[PDB]
Amino acid sequence: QPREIKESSYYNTAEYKSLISEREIQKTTQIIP
Amino acid sequence: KKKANVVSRPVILTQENIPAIFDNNRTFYVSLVGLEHVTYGTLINVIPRFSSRGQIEMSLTIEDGTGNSQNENTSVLPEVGRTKISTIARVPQGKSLLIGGYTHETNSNEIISIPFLSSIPVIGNVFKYKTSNISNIVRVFLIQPREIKESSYYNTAEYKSLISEREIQKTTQIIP
Amino acid sequence: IDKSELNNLGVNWQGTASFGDSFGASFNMSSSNKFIASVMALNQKKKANVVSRPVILTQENIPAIFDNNRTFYVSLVGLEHVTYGTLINVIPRFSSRGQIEMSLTIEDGTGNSQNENTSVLPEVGRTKISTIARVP
Amino acid sequence: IPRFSSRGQIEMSLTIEDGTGNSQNENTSVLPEVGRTKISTIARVPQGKSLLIGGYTHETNSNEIISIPFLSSIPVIGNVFKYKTSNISNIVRVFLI
Amino acid sequence: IDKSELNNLGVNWQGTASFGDSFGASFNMSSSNKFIASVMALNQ
Amino acid sequence: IPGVATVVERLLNNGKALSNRQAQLEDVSLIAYPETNSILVKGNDQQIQIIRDIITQLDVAKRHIELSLWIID
Amino acid sequence: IPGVATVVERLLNNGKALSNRQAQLEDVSLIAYPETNSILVKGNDQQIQIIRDIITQLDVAKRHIELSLWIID
């Protein structure tokens, strides 16, 4: 059974889970206080 | 005594004048009382098309059958031999044709006896030895084609999505 | 969809007999003290339903390829596996009244891997079909 | 190979292979063992949404019953002669972009 | 996502019997003193 | 199985005359663009008219045949 | 076994005359399009007339023969 893909066949995401946190990156590559 | 009936039916759909290929093979197992298998395979390649009065003409190459695999295991399993037929035939729509076939009948008797004493009236029948075999085999390849009309499709009108929208949102939404 | 029923019951006999040191007799024997009987009585039914569904998306008139294979394990009571693989390559496109026409090459099925292990695992054979069809 | 298209949609030509390699006491029960899957295709996505380019579901059901013919049919203790085996399994695998 | 359930329960029987030094009997055996039963009960 | 483009282009080949008709001038340029499953044509008005007519008469429906092969033992 | 297209095209070959008839001018273009199992023809009115007549006289029915081979011992 085939079907044409319409605008209702996509998934609403509207977000983007970053792999790693900004705080984590700052902690790991900031100059040591 | 032994009796066996086997009915196989491949079914393939295609567009007229375009070759179609269908091959398949399964393995049939039987578990011993306290594991014998036979590999049954078929391979049919066909070129169909139409002809006057809506008859269906077809060029057929058919191979089918099992592979030899010797306690009543062969008695239970199909073991229908192997048969290949290559030909071309046309069928009126609504009827079916017997393109190929093969029948076989065997009868055999054997008698062993001591020459003189086995001929005495009463107890002589204890010296003979009589063996007998009888067998009938019939194998038939018929075809029936049919044109596909609007009533030959299945009404579905729906589409089961593989995964749920809620599941996707749960698995790829930013954590609350 | 598969259904099967195998049942057997009855007795097999073999025998030997002697009289004096002169007369020997063997009843239902291939070649050379008394009778033995094997009694069999058993009935086993089996049923299996397997539903597989590959699903692939593409753009019209551009070929798409999808192949996959998993291994199904069953642990013995006190480890048998079957490798199920499919491979579908398709060329889809449109046609009058929005019908979808497709050229299909499909292969699918398992690989032969012989205590009820085969009775539990799918073991659906192998099947390849190559054709072309259009669907409303 | 990605690129853009009208209304800022993103079109991509994709070749994807993924999965494990077969390596047989509940070890396989704990480890992923997700098989192998390759999909080659091309698709375009509106920006802000995600698409299910590939997928594969599988369902298996199996029953087997072994029984002594006659006595296993007696009402009370007959149920001690049967032997019933059953398997059920569902598998879903999805490739979204 | 994978879910699976495998369960089996029941008994398998095998038997042997003798009468005098004359009559031998084997119950549910492939080929040649008394009955054995394997009981299975498990669900995973 | 040849394509419509190849067949038609080979048809309109090596003919020195005019005043054509259809039964149920120079070289045309007829190429196939399968990415959108289309044909690009270049020619005179009469040539394109006969091309349209012959193609329309050429591709119509491609009916479906389903074959059931009974094997009995 | 050659096809009707090949046979007829090879028939209409290397002949310098006109005023033809049928028994029970230049080069025609006759090609085979098996996708719809058809023939594309190009020629004069007399040539197409004789082609239609010869093809109609050529393909009719293709009757069926079934052979049973008895082997007795």
Author numbering:
A (entry chain A): 516 to 548
B (entry chain B): 362 to 395, 401 to 436, 443 to 548
C (entry chain A): 310 to 341, 350 to 395, 401 to 436, 443 to 464
D (entry chain O): 413 to 436, 443 to 515
E (entry chain O): 310 to 341, 350 to 361
F (entry chain B), G (entry chain C): 207 to 230, 261 to 309
From the paper:
The type III secretion system (T3SS) is a large, transmembrane protein machinery used by various pathogenic gram‐negative bacteria to transport virulence factors into the host cell during infection. The T3SS is a large, syringe‐shaped, membrane‐spanning, multimegadalton protein machinery. Here, we combined cryo‐electron microscopy, cross‐linking mass spectrometry, and integrative modeling to determine the structure of the T3SS needle complex from Shigella flexneri.
The secretin domain of MxiD[SctC] forms a large double‐layered antiparallel β‐barrel with 60 strands in each wall (four in each of the 15 secretin subunits). The proximal opening of the OM ring is lined by the N3 domain that contains the structurally conserved ring‐building motif (RBM), which promotes the secretin oligomerization. The amphipathic helix interacts with the later subunit through a hydrophobic cluster on the outer wall surface (W306, I308, V368, L470, V512, and L514) and a single hydrogen bond (T544).
